[PDB]
Symmetry: D3
Subunit: 185 residues, 6 copies
């Protein structure tokens, strides 16, 4: 609807698995640059990392000092481990569920950065948990690095229109985030 | 979305035109029964009347004393005048717009009570304004009295499934309202 | 769309197969009731019969004298033969295609009267041809005679909401036709 | 799709909680009536019960002797315990997932029999698990016992059109199952 | 629908506000080149300009002499004033409404050329009026000048797929126009 | 659905009409490229050619020796004749219908290679038969050669997103085919 958003919650779900070793710097830069472009307290963001497990590195916050510290932490991430992306979505869903209980109309947006190199069962669990996120009200974007398959990530994201490569995705999502911020109450 | 509702705002849009002279008691008691069944401050309601013009008899409120006074004023309504239903929707939309700016996730539900006897241009304006209410985030129900045409009221309401006869309307909408209240945060 | 209809074309597709032998009066009088209720030249109608083959008994017309003669011919129908309903839809679609070439915005409505007792391949062909009618712009209703299967007829009609028992058929369809006629330009 | 079904898998999810103590006969009889109405090996069925926990009483089978034994086990059920309906759906989803891996085009139909008296968190889990069933290809019907709330059950079922009262739900589902069996390869 | 179009009405809604000062040449050239590429009387067009107010510079017409004169007038347009785009859509909708009353099946297409630099309330009114145009049967395209926000223009146009930059948009729209003309009755 | 595919059936519908006389090597190379990249018996393919008539050059098969011989025959194709694409779809639908009767959950994908230069009535027949393919469960992609109109091919394909130019077709469809093979049971 045309109803404004009382909240804007941005959840970064970040692949730090072994396979993205040579792409972590561009994953980090993507996140850092969106953060530095949108410094308004109207936008809250969370940093979630995943490899062998999914962990909330920084819980959802409007506080730019906490965001600064979270980004410093992200810059120091050492890629390694498996690619259990579904746990990244679990970390988002847990937070979205809690936020829902506050009763605000929120643009709950997920940006998942990954190379899409997920083993069969892991992809299945990821699609399941992404659907779970959507059930809680989330809009899911997937930004692919390296040799990601767009159709594969389109099962994680809301649609194929919600899937971008890293460089194109940065420009596209900057516009989307701007639009959502203009649509804030 | 499975996200709970931070608000539940019920807008009664009530036909008080000349054509409903023998049916006002049915309309009033429909409203009175619902108001008396759901006394929780979690439910806010507004009473809008329309004939020659559309007027907000009681602005959206959770206050049961205000609601009591509103019901007492509704009881004394004397049907008469034309059927400018679109103005009834205008009164609802104006309030919905204002409430939107607060940024809460709200079940904004319209219940329009009418015989559906709208002249051609008046029907056109009504559908336009009902669409406008939907754009603001409203769910429109139509409850028909007299010999109402279900297909006609289906263009005002969200769908044919949002159209009920007056004698069956209470039981179905009591259920709907109960369900929404159980989905309150 | 809120745009008015430049035309209203009503296509009766009528089962005259062996299985409805003693139910023909029920079928005919449903048709006659509607025809005599709606005498406006704004409504054009065609009468199509089917059993072993499908045949246009009366081509689409606004002319009430032609409609009178068509009705007289329908009265005298002698049921018998197979149930090749798909040919009945073929007769409607051929006319719909022709009318389409005139370029008017038309409510093209099919009402199919049948017991739905179609053998497997015949049902397949019927669903195919009903879909083809929809592709040409038709809205398909099915009115069930005898102990019909609602879900089966829902494959032919637009949805389960477009299926009615013959006993309740008139009341529902007369309302629908009245609404479409009010939506005429 | 007009494509026939290579399989037809019917999953009964049966409430045996304390709240249905006086209504188990209605629940059992619904299942018994359907099972013995459709004795074709083309229809496979599973009986799942739930109260404090969800348990597969009879795994999906076409074998009528197993079905007989399953029904005799249902005759012995003593209602009691909580209403953890989500676990009933879990038992269904586990079987559907396994069946999916066989690669057949199957009509996977769930019929959940319940009074809908679920506490808030339990209802949340149930809607979540029902959605998960739908993700795996299931069509969910809910058949209501006692004075159930159809809007609430519509959150579990596919839609309000997939919700039926128990005392006139055998007639509705019998027709639906007949139709699905006629759409079998 | 596969039905051919009895008419093809193309509405250019053209931003002549102060913010498009360096881009009017681009906007005019886009219109001029499309008009010159499609001279068939089967295509009718209207030129609407907007800044502080929205005005119909040339009402819908098939007459190429009137179009020639309209283009001459458009060429002399001097950018300046506010950006009340909603009025441009009001000018289109008024014409669409009148044309609807004729009862022809028409491809009513809007092309809005703008930088999308609308202040908050103006954007709200614009989205409201674009929705109204859609309700009347219009398909809305947005062609952006400058570094426009695609997501923002996607609120005006039917979808993000209906949003184009100037060069891609020209090629895309001449293909769309060619296709619609091939679909003429 | 998240349910894996029991089968993956790929139907190439290839334009060999006079209008593509100097472009056959483009069309052939596209097919040869895809065949050679995907040699898994999990993928079955059919080669259909059309000009004046539509003919199945190679019936649906997983046999790579038959595929090898099929490609050899495709290489030798000599363009000429009319563009009766609808017959190409008829050859695909015939096979899809047969395979449906086996009752496996199959990804039935059509890739139509054409310049889209179809005369009015031929385009009508093509849209009709493509719709029929979809009704049987097919997903339709169109890959355009020469100066094709994307909007026109979008009427044959499922959507505009299912239409690709021949120079961008391989990358997109390779990714799609890979994804479907990964989603095999
Ligand atoms: Mg990895
Ligand atoms: Mg009145
Ligand atoms: Mg018969
Ligand atoms: Mg219980
Ligand atoms: Mg401006
Ligand atoms: Mg050709």
């Amino acid at each position: 609807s045309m109803a404004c958003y009382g909240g804007f919650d941005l959840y970064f779900i970040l692949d730090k698995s072994g396979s993205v070793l040579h792409h972590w710097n561009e994953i980090y830069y993507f996140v850092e640059q969106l953060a530095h472009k949108f410094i308004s307290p109207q936008l809250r963001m969370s940093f979630i990392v995943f490899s062998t497990r999914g962990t909330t590195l920084m819980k959802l916050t409007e506080d730019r000092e906490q965001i600064r510290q979270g980004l410093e932490e992200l810059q120091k991430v050492l890629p390694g481990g498996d690619t259990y992306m579904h746990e990244g979505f679990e970390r988002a869903s847990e937070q979205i569920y809690y936020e829902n209980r506050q009763g605000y109309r929120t643009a709950s947006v997920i940006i998942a950065l990954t190379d899409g190199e997920l083993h069969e069962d892991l992809f299945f669990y990821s699609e399941r948990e992404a659907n779970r996120s959507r059930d809680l009200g989330a809009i899911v974007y997937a930004v692919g690095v390296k040799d990601f398959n767009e159709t594969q990530l389109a099962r994680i994201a809301d649609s194929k229109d919600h899937v971008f490569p890293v460089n194109d995705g940065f420009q596209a999502l900057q516009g989307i985030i701007h639009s959502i911020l203009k649509k804030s109450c």
